[PDB]
Short mmCIF file of C-alpha atoms in Angstrom, two decimals:
data_model
loop_
_atom_site.label_atom_id
_atom_site.label_comp_id
_atom_site.label_asym_id
_atom_site.label_seq_id
_atom_site.Cartn_x
_atom_site.Cartn_y
_atom_site.Cartn_z
CA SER A 1 0.00 0.00 0.00
CA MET A 2 3.09 2.18 0.30
CA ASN A 3 3.20 2.32 -3.51
CA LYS A 4 0.49 4.97 -4.01
CA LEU A 5 1.36 8.65 -4.30
CA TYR A 6 -0.60 11.77 -3.53
CA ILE A 7 0.42 14.81 -5.56
CA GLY A 8 -0.67 18.13 -4.05
CA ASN A 9 -0.53 21.89 -4.53
CA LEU A 10 -1.56 21.58 -8.19
CA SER A 11 -3.11 24.46 -10.06
CA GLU A 12 -6.56 23.97 -11.54
CA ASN A 13 -5.16 23.55 -15.07
CA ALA A 14 -2.68 20.79 -14.18
CA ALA A 15 -3.10 17.94 -16.67
CA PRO A 16 -1.96 14.29 -16.58
CA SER A 17 0.61 15.13 -19.26
CA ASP A 18 2.21 17.70 -16.92
CA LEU A 19 2.69 15.02 -14.24
CA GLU A 20 3.84 12.40 -16.77
CA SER A 21 6.68 14.68 -17.89
CA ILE A 22 7.64 15.50 -14.31
CA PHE A 23 7.94 11.81 -13.47
CA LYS A 24 9.68 11.06 -16.78
CA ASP A 25 12.15 13.92 -16.17
CA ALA A 26 12.91 12.43 -12.76
CA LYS A 27 13.05 8.93 -14.34
CA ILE A 28 10.36 7.55 -11.99
CA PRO A 29 8.19 4.75 -13.44
CA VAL A 30 4.51 4.64 -12.64
CA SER A 31 2.40 1.50 -12.75
CA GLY A 32 -0.91 3.22 -13.49
CA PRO A 33 -2.40 6.44 -14.82
CA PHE A 34 -2.30 9.84 -13.18
CA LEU A 35 -5.75 10.46 -11.71
CA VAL A 36 -6.08 14.25 -11.57
CA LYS A 37 -8.69 16.03 -9.47
CA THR A 38 -8.86 19.75 -8.64
CA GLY A 39 -5.67 20.86 -6.90
CA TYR A 40 -4.31 17.33 -6.39
CA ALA A 41 -3.80 13.96 -8.04
CA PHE A 42 -2.93 10.30 -7.47
CA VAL A 43 -0.53 7.92 -9.19
CA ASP A 44 0.87 4.51 -8.25
CA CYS A 45 4.48 3.43 -8.50
CA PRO A 46 5.60 -0.15 -9.16
CA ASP A 47 6.83 -0.53 -5.56
CA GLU A 48 7.51 1.45 -2.39
CA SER A 49 11.14 2.11 -3.31
CA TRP A 50 10.12 3.93 -6.50
CA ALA A 51 7.37 5.83 -4.69
CA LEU A 52 9.80 6.92 -1.97
CA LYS A 53 12.22 7.95 -4.70
CA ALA A 54 9.45 10.07 -6.23
CA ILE A 55 8.74 11.74 -2.88
CA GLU A 56 12.41 12.46 -2.23
CA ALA A 57 13.04 13.69 -5.77
CA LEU A 58 9.92 15.80 -6.28
CA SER A 59 8.10 16.98 -3.16
CA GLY A 60 8.83 20.66 -2.66
CA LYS A 61 11.51 20.70 -5.35
CA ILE A 62 9.69 20.72 -8.71
CA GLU A 63 7.42 23.60 -9.65
CA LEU A 64 4.47 23.28 -12.00
CA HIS A 65 2.66 26.48 -13.03
CA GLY A 66 4.72 28.43 -10.54
CA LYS A 67 3.78 26.20 -7.57
CA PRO A 68 6.10 23.71 -5.79
CA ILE A 69 4.35 20.33 -6.11
CA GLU A 70 3.78 18.14 -3.07
CA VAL A 71 4.41 14.41 -3.51
CA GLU A 72 3.47 12.33 -0.46
CA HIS A 73 2.39 8.81 0.39
CA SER A 74 -1.34 8.64 -0.29
CA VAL A 75 -3.02 7.99 3.04
CA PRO A 76 -6.82 7.91 3.46
CA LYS A 77 -7.92 9.86 6.50
CA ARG A 78 -9.09 6.73 8.31
CA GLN A 79 -5.54 5.30 8.04
CA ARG A 80 -3.80 8.33 9.56
CA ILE A 81 -3.46 6.87 13.04
CA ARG A 82 -0.13 5.95 14.69
CA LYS A 83 2.38 5.54 11.84
CA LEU A 84 4.63 8.25 10.39
CA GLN A 85 7.56 8.47 8.02
CA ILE A 86 10.42 10.87 8.70
CA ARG A 87 12.53 12.07 5.77
CA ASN A 88 15.53 14.38 5.39
CA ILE A 89 17.21 12.96 8.52
CA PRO A 90 20.86 14.19 8.58
CA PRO A 91 23.07 11.52 7.04
CA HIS A 92 25.02 10.24 10.06
CA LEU A 93 22.64 11.27 12.83
CA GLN A 94 23.15 9.23 15.97
CA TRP A 95 20.00 7.21 16.66
CA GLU A 96 20.32 8.34 20.29
CA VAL A 97 19.55 11.87 19.10
CA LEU A 98 16.53 10.86 17.00
CA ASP A 99 15.18 8.77 19.90
CA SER A 100 15.53 11.77 22.22
CA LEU A 101 13.27 13.74 19.88
CA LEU A 102 10.78 10.95 19.21
CA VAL A 103 10.10 10.07 22.85
CA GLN A 104 9.14 13.63 23.74
CA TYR A 105 5.79 12.90 22.03
CA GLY A 106 5.01 9.36 23.14
CA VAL A 107 6.18 5.79 23.39
CA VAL A 108 7.73 4.61 20.15
CA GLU A 109 5.96 1.31 19.51
CA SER A 110 7.99 0.68 16.36
CA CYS A 111 10.84 2.37 14.51
CA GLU A 112 12.48 1.06 11.34
CA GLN A 113 15.12 2.60 9.10
CA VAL A 114 14.10 2.58 5.42
CA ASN A 115 16.84 1.87 2.90
CA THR A 116 17.57 4.71 0.48
CA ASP A 117 20.41 5.92 -1.73
CA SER A 118 19.82 9.60 -0.96
CA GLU A 119 22.27 11.52 1.23
CA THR A 120 19.72 11.58 4.07
CA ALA A 121 17.97 8.90 6.10
CA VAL A 122 14.32 7.82 6.34
CA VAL A 123 12.59 6.01 9.19
CA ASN A 124 9.07 4.76 9.81
CA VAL A 125 7.71 5.32 13.30
CA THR A 126 4.72 3.75 15.01
CA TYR A 127 3.73 5.68 18.11
CA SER A 128 1.69 3.98 20.80
CA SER A 129 -1.44 6.01 20.05
CA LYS A 130 -3.15 8.27 17.54
CA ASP A 131 -2.70 11.36 19.72
CA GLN A 132 1.05 10.76 20.08
CA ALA A 133 1.68 10.47 16.34
CA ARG A 134 -0.39 13.59 15.74
CA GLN A 135 1.61 15.67 18.23
CA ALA A 136 4.88 14.26 16.88
CA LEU A 137 3.84 15.19 13.33
CA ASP A 138 2.92 18.73 14.38
CA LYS A 139 6.22 19.18 16.28
CA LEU A 140 8.70 17.30 14.04
CA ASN A 141 7.44 18.22 10.56
CA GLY A 142 9.59 21.18 9.61
CA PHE A 143 11.92 20.87 12.62
CA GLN A 144 15.39 22.10 11.75
CA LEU A 145 18.21 19.75 12.74
CA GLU A 146 21.82 20.49 11.71
CA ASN A 147 20.71 22.59 8.70
CA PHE A 148 18.36 19.80 7.60
CA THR A 149 14.59 20.28 7.77
CA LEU A 150 12.81 17.11 8.89
CA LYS A 151 9.89 16.10 6.69
CA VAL A 152 7.26 14.15 8.62
CA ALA A 153 4.07 12.75 7.12
CA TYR A 154 1.52 10.01 7.75
CA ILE A 155 1.84 6.53 6.32
CA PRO A 156 -1.04 4.01 6.19
CA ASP A 157 -1.92 2.54 9.56
CA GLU A 158 -3.37 -0.94 8.77
CA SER B 1 -16.90 -14.36 -30.92
CA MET B 2 -17.44 -12.82 -27.49
CA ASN B 3 -19.46 -15.69 -26.04
CA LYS B 4 -16.48 -18.04 -25.77
CA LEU B 5 -15.01 -18.34 -22.28
CA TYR B 6 -11.60 -19.29 -20.98
CA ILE B 7 -11.65 -20.87 -17.51
CA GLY B 8 -8.30 -20.85 -15.70
CA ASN B 9 -6.67 -21.81 -12.40
CA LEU B 10 -8.38 -25.21 -12.44
CA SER B 11 -7.07 -28.11 -10.42
CA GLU B 12 -5.80 -31.11 -12.34
CA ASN B 13 -8.74 -33.10 -10.94
CA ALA B 14 -11.42 -30.81 -12.39
CA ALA B 15 -14.04 -32.59 -14.50
CA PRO B 16 -16.77 -31.10 -16.71
CA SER B 17 -19.34 -32.00 -14.05
CA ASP B 18 -17.56 -29.64 -11.67
CA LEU B 19 -18.04 -26.79 -14.11
CA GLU B 20 -21.62 -27.74 -15.04
CA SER B 21 -22.70 -27.50 -11.39
CA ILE B 22 -20.85 -24.18 -11.02
CA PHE B 23 -22.61 -22.57 -14.00
CA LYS B 24 -25.90 -24.21 -12.98
CA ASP B 25 -25.77 -22.72 -9.48
CA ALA B 26 -24.86 -19.31 -10.87
CA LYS B 27 -27.82 -19.67 -13.28
CA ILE B 28 -25.62 -19.22 -16.38
CA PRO B 29 -26.53 -21.33 -19.44
CA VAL B 30 -23.95 -22.73 -21.82
CA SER B 31 -24.43 -23.37 -25.53
CA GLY B 32 -22.01 -26.32 -25.68
CA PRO B 33 -19.87 -28.70 -23.65
CA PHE B 34 -17.01 -27.87 -21.33
CA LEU B 35 -13.64 -28.83 -22.84
CA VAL B 36 -11.28 -29.49 -19.92
CA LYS B 37 -7.55 -29.30 -20.68
CA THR B 38 -4.82 -29.21 -17.92
CA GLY B 39 -5.54 -26.46 -15.41
CA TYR B 40 -7.94 -24.62 -17.73
CA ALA B 41 -11.10 -25.16 -19.77
CA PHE B 42 -13.16 -23.69 -22.62
CA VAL B 43 -16.94 -23.30 -22.91
CA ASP B 44 -19.44 -21.24 -24.91
CA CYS B 45 -22.33 -19.18 -23.61
CA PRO B 46 -25.40 -18.55 -25.79
CA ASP B 47 -24.46 -14.89 -26.43
CA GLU B 48 -22.08 -12.11 -25.39
CA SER B 49 -24.19 -11.01 -22.45
CA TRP B 50 -24.27 -14.44 -20.81
CA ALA B 51 -20.50 -14.66 -21.34
CA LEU B 52 -20.02 -11.30 -19.57
CA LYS B 53 -22.31 -12.38 -16.72
CA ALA B 54 -20.21 -15.52 -16.33
CA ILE B 55 -17.07 -13.41 -15.99
CA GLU B 56 -18.59 -11.06 -13.41
CA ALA B 57 -20.45 -13.70 -11.39
CA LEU B 58 -17.75 -16.38 -11.42
CA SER B 59 -14.20 -15.07 -11.91
CA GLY B 60 -12.27 -15.04 -8.62
CA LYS B 61 -15.52 -15.63 -6.69
CA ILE B 62 -15.93 -19.42 -6.93
CA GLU B 63 -13.45 -22.00 -5.71
CA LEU B 64 -13.15 -25.49 -7.13
CA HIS B 65 -11.11 -28.08 -5.22
CA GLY B 66 -9.67 -25.23 -3.15
CA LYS B 67 -8.55 -22.86 -5.89
CA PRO B 68 -10.58 -19.89 -7.10
CA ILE B 69 -11.47 -20.31 -10.74
CA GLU B 70 -10.76 -17.56 -13.28
CA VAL B 71 -13.21 -16.74 -16.08
CA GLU B 72 -12.45 -14.47 -19.01
CA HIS B 73 -13.20 -13.92 -22.66
CA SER B 74 -11.35 -16.49 -24.74
CA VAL B 75 -9.11 -14.46 -27.04
CA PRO B 76 -6.38 -16.16 -29.11
CA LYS B 77 -3.09 -14.31 -28.84
CA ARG B 78 -3.13 -13.21 -32.49
CA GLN B 79 -6.52 -11.57 -31.84
CA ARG B 80 -5.29 -9.53 -28.84
CA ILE B 81 -4.63 -6.26 -30.65
CA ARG B 82 -6.49 -2.92 -30.27
CA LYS B 83 -9.62 -3.85 -28.31
CA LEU B 84 -10.11 -3.99 -24.54
CA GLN B 85 -13.03 -4.48 -22.19
CA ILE B 86 -13.04 -2.51 -18.92
CA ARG B 87 -15.18 -3.82 -16.07
CA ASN B 88 -15.98 -2.74 -12.52
CA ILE B 89 -16.14 0.97 -13.42
CA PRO B 90 -17.68 2.92 -10.48
CA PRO B 91 -21.38 3.51 -11.27
CA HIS B 92 -21.45 7.31 -11.42
CA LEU B 93 -18.03 8.01 -12.92
CA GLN B 94 -18.00 11.04 -15.18
CA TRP B 95 -16.99 9.75 -18.60
CA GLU B 96 -14.45 12.58 -18.75
CA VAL B 97 -12.64 11.00 -15.79
CA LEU B 98 -12.39 7.64 -17.53
CA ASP B 99 -11.38 9.37 -20.77
CA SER B 100 -8.57 11.28 -19.05
CA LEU B 101 -7.19 7.88 -18.06
CA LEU B 102 -7.70 6.22 -21.44
CA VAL B 103 -5.92 8.89 -23.45
CA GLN B 104 -2.73 8.61 -21.42
CA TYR B 105 -2.04 5.44 -23.41
CA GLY B 106 -3.05 6.30 -26.97
CA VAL B 107 -5.83 7.41 -29.27
CA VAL B 108 -9.27 5.97 -28.51
CA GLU B 109 -10.80 5.17 -31.90
CA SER B 110 -14.02 4.07 -30.23
CA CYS B 111 -15.64 3.50 -26.84
CA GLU B 112 -18.92 1.64 -26.34
CA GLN B 113 -20.91 1.09 -23.19
CA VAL B 114 -21.96 -2.51 -22.63
CA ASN B 115 -25.27 -3.41 -21.06
CA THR B 116 -24.85 -5.15 -17.74
CA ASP B 117 -27.04 -6.08 -14.79
CA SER B 118 -24.15 -5.02 -12.55
CA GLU B 119 -24.18 -1.69 -10.76
CA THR B 120 -20.71 -1.10 -12.18
CA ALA B 121 -20.24 -0.05 -15.78
CA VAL B 122 -18.51 -1.91 -18.62
CA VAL B 123 -17.03 -0.40 -21.78
CA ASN B 124 -15.36 -1.85 -24.85
CA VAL B 125 -12.48 0.37 -26.01
CA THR B 126 -10.61 0.29 -29.32
CA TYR B 127 -7.20 2.00 -29.37
CA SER B 128 -5.48 2.99 -32.60
CA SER B 129 -2.77 0.36 -32.33
CA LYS B 130 -1.73 -2.82 -30.53
CA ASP B 131 1.03 -1.21 -28.44
CA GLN B 132 -1.40 1.39 -27.05
CA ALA B 133 -3.91 -1.27 -25.98
CA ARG B 134 -1.15 -3.41 -24.50
CA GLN B 135 0.09 -0.42 -22.51
CA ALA B 136 -3.44 0.53 -21.45
CA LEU B 137 -4.17 -3.01 -20.27
CA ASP B 138 -0.97 -3.22 -18.23
CA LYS B 139 -1.55 0.18 -16.60
CA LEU B 140 -5.34 0.06 -16.11
CA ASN B 141 -5.83 -3.53 -14.94
CA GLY B 142 -5.99 -3.38 -11.15
CA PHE B 143 -6.15 0.42 -11.14
CA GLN B 144 -8.15 1.67 -8.17
CA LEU B 145 -10.66 4.45 -8.79
CA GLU B 146 -13.14 5.66 -6.16
CA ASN B 147 -12.73 2.39 -4.21
CA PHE B 148 -13.28 0.18 -7.30
CA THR B 149 -10.58 -1.97 -8.87
CA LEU B 150 -10.78 -1.71 -12.65
CA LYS B 151 -10.66 -5.00 -14.54
CA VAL B 152 -9.24 -4.76 -18.06
CA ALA B 153 -8.89 -7.69 -20.47
CA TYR B 154 -8.59 -8.16 -24.21
CA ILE B 155 -11.50 -8.87 -26.50
CA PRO B 156 -11.09 -10.31 -30.00
CA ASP B 157 -9.76 -7.84 -32.54
CA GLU B 158 -10.55 -10.18 -35.40
CA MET B 159 -10.48 -7.58 -38.18
CA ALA B 160 -6.99 -6.23 -37.40
#
């Protein structure tokens, strides 16, 4: 389920062909069509490694019609519960440091490093409850750590 | 013709009587005998609409000897060219939404709605060329739209 992308911050005249070229430029394969709504869209990638590569390569970095696009894991609202992904973690950050930040918002039920060839690290975090993950997302998303800006977003909970 | 069925994922024990009772229970007539090969079978329905009903009622929904059977239009490989059937379209989908998906893969020479007793829609699509249909099938089969999983398979392109 970690294969599906949400594309946000699209202008009203964004077309599938715009998104096709953006993914082609970044050399990201998609396994289905771009479904475009009004201001946002969905596309699937062949696996979670490609979809993470899309997120890392595109979200906040590529502009379409003057607007930086958002590319995020697609998560239905009912599946935004305890699980988060953290991106842009400084390359050699001691896990002791990350833990000291995570536990300020709850008990970390689960934490797993996600393999990636980018300079920076990625980890999935399951907090013990919905309220903990929500506070952690509010406090860690955008948090500046050693001139890196943490990117924190929901991933599908069950 | 589009009343010929391919039945796949059969056990090696499957007999015609197994398939007779399956179609009988699902209230689907056949116009000839079941021809059981090795892990798959062929059979004809009286017309296209019974063949479609077989696909929607039976495919992936009925198990025989522990495996779910698969039911699809029988299309020889040489007849898999420009034409696709799309099933399980969400009932109220704006046709412009479906079209915006279809055109990502080529030029749609024609699109026809198929009658169905299902609440979901079914269309037969003809792309300009074989590579466009093959791309559309690979990218649209299993594609999830408004909580429905599109089902896309070939239909005979006998003329091309």
